[PDB]
Amino acid sequence: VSQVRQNYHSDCEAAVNRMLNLELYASYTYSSMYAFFDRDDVALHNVAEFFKEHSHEEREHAEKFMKYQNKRGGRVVLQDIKKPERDEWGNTLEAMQAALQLEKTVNQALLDLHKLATDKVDPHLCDFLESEYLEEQVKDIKRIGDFITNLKRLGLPENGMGEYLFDKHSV
Amino acid sequence: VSQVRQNYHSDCEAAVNRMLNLELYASYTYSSMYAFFDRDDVALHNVAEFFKEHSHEEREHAEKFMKYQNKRGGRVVLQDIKKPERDEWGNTLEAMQAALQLEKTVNQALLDLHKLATDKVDPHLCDFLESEYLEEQVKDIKRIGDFITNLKRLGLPENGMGEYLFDKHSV
Amino acid sequence: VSQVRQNYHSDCEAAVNRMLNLELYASYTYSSMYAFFDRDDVALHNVAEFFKEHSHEEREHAEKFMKYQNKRGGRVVLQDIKKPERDEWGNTLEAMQAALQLEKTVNQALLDLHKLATDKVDPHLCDFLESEYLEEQVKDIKRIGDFITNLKRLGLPENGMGEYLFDKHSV
Amino acid sequence: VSQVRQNYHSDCEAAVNRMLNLELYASYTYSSMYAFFDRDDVALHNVAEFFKEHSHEEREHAEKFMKYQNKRGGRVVLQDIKKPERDEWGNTLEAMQAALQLEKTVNQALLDLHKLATDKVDPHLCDFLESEYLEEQVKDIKRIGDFITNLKRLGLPENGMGEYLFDKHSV
Ligand SMILES: [Cl-]
Ligand SMILES: [Cl-]
Ligand SMILES: [Cl-]
Ligand SMILES: [Cl-]
Ligand SMILES: [Cl-]
Ligand SMILES: [Cl-]
Ligand SMILES: [Cl-]
Ligand SMILES: [Cl-]
Ligand SMILES: [Cl-]
Ligand SMILES: [Cl-]
Ligand SMILES: [Cl-]
Ligand SMILES: [Cl-]
Ligand SMILES: [Cl-]
Ligand SMILES: [Cl-]
Ligand SMILES: [Cl-]
Ligand SMILES: [Cl-]
Ligand SMILES: [Cl-]
Ligand SMILES: [Cl-]
Ligand SMILES: [Cl-]
Ligand SMILES: [Cl-]
Ligand SMILES: [Fe+2]
Ligand SMILES: [Fe+2]
Ligand SMILES: [Fe+2]
Ligand SMILES: [Fe+2]
Ligand SMILES: [Fe+2]
Ligand SMILES: [Fe+2]
Ligand SMILES: [Fe+2]
Ligand SMILES: [Fe+2]
Ligand SMILES: [Fe+2]
Ligand SMILES: [Fe+2]
Ligand SMILES: [Fe+2]
Ligand SMILES: [Fe+2]
Ligand SMILES: [Fe+2]
Ligand SMILES: [Fe+2]
Ligand SMILES: [Fe+2]
Ligand SMILES: [Fe+2]
Ligand SMILES: [Mg+2]
Ligand SMILES: [Mg+2]
Ligand SMILES: [Mg+2]
Ligand SMILES: [Mg+2]
Ligand SMILES: [Mg+2]
Ligand SMILES: [Mg+2]
Ligand SMILES: [Mg+2]
Ligand SMILES: [Mg+2]
Ligand SMILES: [Mg+2]
Ligand SMILES: [Mg+2]
Ligand SMILES: [Mg+2]
Ligand SMILES: [Mg+2]
Ligand SMILES: [Mg+2]
Ligand SMILES: [Mg+2]
Ligand SMILES: [Mg+2]
Ligand SMILES: [Mg+2]
Ligand SMILES: [Mg+2]
Ligand SMILES: [Mg+2]
Ligand SMILES: [Mg+2]
Ligand SMILES: [Mg+2]
Ligand SMILES: [Mg+2]
Ligand SMILES: [Mg+2]
Ligand SMILES: [Mg+2]
Incomplete structure (x- = not known):
């Protein structure tokens, strides 16, 4: 019922929210990789920075979906960001x-x-x-x-x- | 029969002309809003300028369709630009x-x-x-x-x- | 057993991980507030940007704890980032x-x-x-x-x- | 009995002198490492310079303790700087x-x-x-x-x- 909404299906709105979550999940996984390569017993700092950069870009991908949702008159719905699949x-x-x-x-x-x-x-x-x-x-x-x-x-x-x-x- | 024409349907050519007219109609409506807010008994000049700007952009939208029509080998056909729905x-x-x-x-x-x-x-x-x-x-x-x-x-x-x-x- | 570890208690290491999670939770809550104020039916964009900025700073607070953990020879352990308490x-x-x-x-x-x-x-x-x-x-x-x-x-x-x-x- | 002395325990004054000596000891050890890596039969000059730099910083750590001692009204007492544990x-x-x-x-x-x-x-x-x-x-x-x-x-x-x-x- 948003005043701006036009040609925006409920299914697409929901799928955009799910996609936003996946972008955040990817960001978190890359942040884990950064922390791992920064460990004193791993110590590959350029690799660590590569993954840190990737983490930042995934966060930007997520923010762009948030902005998109609002532009179309959809509503951002957030869910938990699951921890990465591995700890190391x-x-x-x-x-x-x-x-x-x-x-x-x-x-x-x-x-x-x-x-x-x-x-x-x-x-x-x-x-x-x-x-x-x-x-x-x-x-x-x-x-x-x-x-x-x-x-x-x-x-x-x-x-x-x-x-x-x-x-x-x-x- | 234009020498440049390729994969351009007559229906699309006609619809582009109708779209051009609608852009011009929108330009004219915004120009009316500009004039209204510039009235001495309305006098909201930043609002007036906002609508003046929108009028100019609609004219640019129209010109871009004219250029498009020619690029594809279609022919620009103009119709009357209807006056806006309201006078005030x-x-x-x-x-x-x-x-x-x-x-x-x-x-x-x-x-x-x-x-x-x-x-x-x-x-x-x-x-x-x-x-x-x-x-x-x-x-x-x-x-x-x-x-x-x-x-x-x-x-x-x-x-x-x-x-x-x-x-x-x-x- | 990290070669760099000195005077760093296991309890502190664990508490640093929990604190990291809370910083991320705060970041996510502020991102939700940003998205809310960016809604077409809310539309307070300077308020939205204020919360967006706060979200970014919380992420930086989290990253600094990750770096700290590694500097002391502790090990970053991540958990789910819980969604904010409210949707609006x-x-x-x-x-x-x-x-x-x-x-x-x-x-x-x-x-x-x-x-x-x-x-x-x-x-x-x-x-x-x-x-x-x-x-x-x-x-x-x-x-x-x-x-x-x-x-x-x-x-x-x-x-x-x-x-x-x-x-x-x-x- | 220094006119500036306030809340400065004799034990702390003595421990500051011992700490000063240890900083100087560390400086001397790093200078030994510098000389070793500069040997024609070792010849790792960037490693040598790394240790030379560390030697200089330890000397600065020592000087800062000397200055501290005087600021608090304590008295600098010097002892021999022991040679490093190894010659090579x-x-x-x-x-x-x-x-x-x-x-x-x-x-x-x-x-x-x-x-x-x-x-x-x-x-x-x-x-x-x-x-x-x-x-x-x-x-x-x-x-x-x-x-x-x-x-x-x-x-x-x-x-x-x-x-x-x-x-x-x-x-
Ligand atoms: Cl719709
Ligand atoms: Cl449609
Ligand atoms: Cl949803
Ligand atoms: Cl995967
Ligand atoms: Cl694992
Ligand atoms: Cl054709
Ligand atoms: Cl074709
Ligand atoms: Cl036509
Ligand atoms: Cl209309
Ligand atoms: Cl009217
Ligand atoms: Cl320890
Ligand atoms: Cl201790
Ligand atoms: Cl933990
Ligand atoms: Cl709270
Ligand atoms: Cl709610
Ligand atoms: Cl005293
Ligand atoms: Cl006191
Ligand atoms: Cl002493
Ligand atoms: Cl030692
Ligand atoms: Cl030796
Ligand atoms: Fe990329
Ligand atoms: Fe990437
Ligand atoms: Fe992405
Ligand atoms: Fe990616
Ligand atoms: Fe515009
Ligand atoms: Fe416009
Ligand atoms: Fe337009
Ligand atoms: Fe328009
Ligand atoms: Fe702040
Ligand atoms: Fe803050
Ligand atoms: Fe914080
Ligand atoms: Fe905060
Ligand atoms: Fe240093
Ligand atoms: Fe050092
Ligand atoms: Fe030192
Ligand atoms: Fe040192
Ligand atoms: Mg829906
Ligand atoms: Mg998912
Ligand atoms: Mg480093
Ligand atoms: Mg390439
Ligand atoms: Mg492209
Ligand atoms: Mg584009
Ligand atoms: Mg495209
Ligand atoms: Mg789980
Ligand atoms: Mg198709
Ligand atoms: Mg035709
Ligand atoms: Mg029409
Ligand atoms: Mg008429
Ligand atoms: Mg204290
Ligand atoms: Mg432990
Ligand atoms: Mg917690
Ligand atoms: Mg705006
Ligand atoms: Mg103030
Ligand atoms: Mg301070
Ligand atoms: Mg400091
Ligand atoms: Mg839950
Ligand atoms: Mg004494
Ligand atoms: Mg000693
Ligand atoms: Mg001796």
Whole structure:
């Protein structure tokens, strides 16, 4: 019943709230990876900063959905932000593989939201996803995949020297 | 039969002309609101300037459709620009409510044009609407809705002090 | 068993993790208040930005605890970030009263952590709380209290004009 | 009997002199590490400079205690500065492990001095230690621990290439 609401389906409004939660979940997972690589017994500070940066960008992705919801006359509904799946992340390769999986999970949710927006004939929402989310996902997935290839090339997980070199030359 | 024409349906060409007319109609309505708020017995000059600005932007929306028509090899066909629905606009709240309705009418026509472009499999026209029109509409509808909420908060139409304060602090 | 760990009690390590969670909880509550005041039917954008800023600062408070934990050789353990207590915040006065209560809750947890640090004879942790947290809390509590006094002075919740004026002149 | 003396216990005065000596001892140990890494048969010049810098900072820590003693009306009493425990330091890993142990020894003495100051109800001395010494210690201990983790990762002591890489990329 919002005075601004036009062509905005209840299903899309709800899916936007769920997507917001997933962005926050991703932010929290990256913050966990940051803290892990900052441990004195891990100590890969450029890797830590990479994940800290990713955490910040996910928070921005979430805020943009909040703003979107209000612009369309939907109502932001928040849920708990679940803690990350792991408390420790093994090493740079394990963490990067988890990040790849996470970005693909986020991407799948965005693609699913686009399918819903398409089904409900909401071109504004489709454009929003295409212009603000989908290409960012493809770029990040590619960058993380490239990193994984290099970490394998460097002999991870066994090759500690390789891991050191990655932190010094790749991030 | 234009040498440049490719994948441009006659129905879309005609609908673009009708949309151009509606943009001009919106421009003219906003110019009327400008003149009303500039009256010596109304005298809300920041509100007047707000509507003058909106009138100018609608004229730009119209010109962009003219350019689009020619780019696709369609032919601009003009019709009369109908005078606005009212000669006087009551007060800032009444005018803002009319502006909201007008922007939603324009938005509906743009969404309908997008449906037609989709039906005729014209991705260039769909992209044009999404990239140049649809988000501008959502932004303006949100801004005007926010204004209406504040005008009600300020006690319009009865509260003259509230109306004065809005002109001095909101526009 | 961290090589860096010295004079850092397990109880303090655990309490630092709980404090980190509370900072994140506060951040999330402020983000909810931001989204509420950005609603088209609320539309107090300076109030919204005030709460957005507070949300960002709470996230920084959390990150500083993460860094602290690692510096002392403790281990960051994350838990779910609970959703805020309310989905809607009434008006500027209600939200400010909730913010005051929240800041006092955060302050009490910091004071309790200081008591624990004192009990465990950890002057580094005591200094950290005193130099980085306790004065920030006193300042914010005072600012929010001052706001509440002014909102009451302005006739909240009934006086919509008062609420408008606060958003334009106080934040 | 100094005219400036107020709330300064004889025990604290004596403990400040002992602490001054320990700072000088640490400076001398770091100067030894500098000279070792500057040897033509060791030749890790960035590691050498790291330890030279640490030596200079310990001398500054000592001078600040001298100034403190006089400010409180205590009297500086100097003792011999004992030569370092070793004449040669093995390699970067061995030296870093010795540095970690040294910084923890210095930290323990500072914490013990804080306990004494607390017992004698000397908040000025407590504040001095907290504001000028304790956080510097935590920072340096963390940095050295991080280095040790990386040196182990790089295969020290056996991996000469790892040792070379550390000197070129970590210090
Ligand atoms: Cl709708
Ligand atoms: Cl529609
Ligand atoms: Cl929902
Ligand atoms: Cl785990
Ligand atoms: Cl995942
Ligand atoms: Cl054609
Ligand atoms: Cl075609
Ligand atoms: Cl036509
Ligand atoms: Cl009329
Ligand atoms: Cl209309
Ligand atoms: Cl300990
Ligand atoms: Cl101790
Ligand atoms: Cl814990
Ligand atoms: Cl609620
Ligand atoms: Cl609370
Ligand atoms: Cl005395
Ligand atoms: Cl005294
Ligand atoms: Cl002495
Ligand atoms: Cl020796
Ligand atoms: Cl030692
Ligand atoms: Fe990312
Ligand atoms: Fe994201
Ligand atoms: Fe992401
Ligand atoms: Fe990215
Ligand atoms: Fe407009
Ligand atoms: Fe328009
Ligand atoms: Fe418009
Ligand atoms: Fe506009
Ligand atoms: Fe705050
Ligand atoms: Fe906080
Ligand atoms: Fe706070
Ligand atoms: Fe603050
Ligand atoms: Fe040092
Ligand atoms: Fe020192
Ligand atoms: Fe030191
Ligand atoms: Fe240092
Ligand atoms: Mg619904
Ligand atoms: Mg979910
Ligand atoms: Mg759970
Ligand atoms: Mg389609
Ligand atoms: Mg597009
Ligand atoms: Mg793009
Ligand atoms: Mg690349
Ligand atoms: Mg035709
Ligand atoms: Mg028409
Ligand atoms: Mg007529
Ligand atoms: Mg766009
Ligand atoms: Mg706005
Ligand atoms: Mg424990
Ligand atoms: Mg808690
Ligand atoms: Mg719950
Ligand atoms: Mg104290
Ligand atoms: Mg302070
Ligand atoms: Mg003040
Ligand atoms: Mg004496
Ligand atoms: Mg001694
Ligand atoms: Mg001797
Ligand atoms: Mg300090
Ligand atoms: Mg560091």
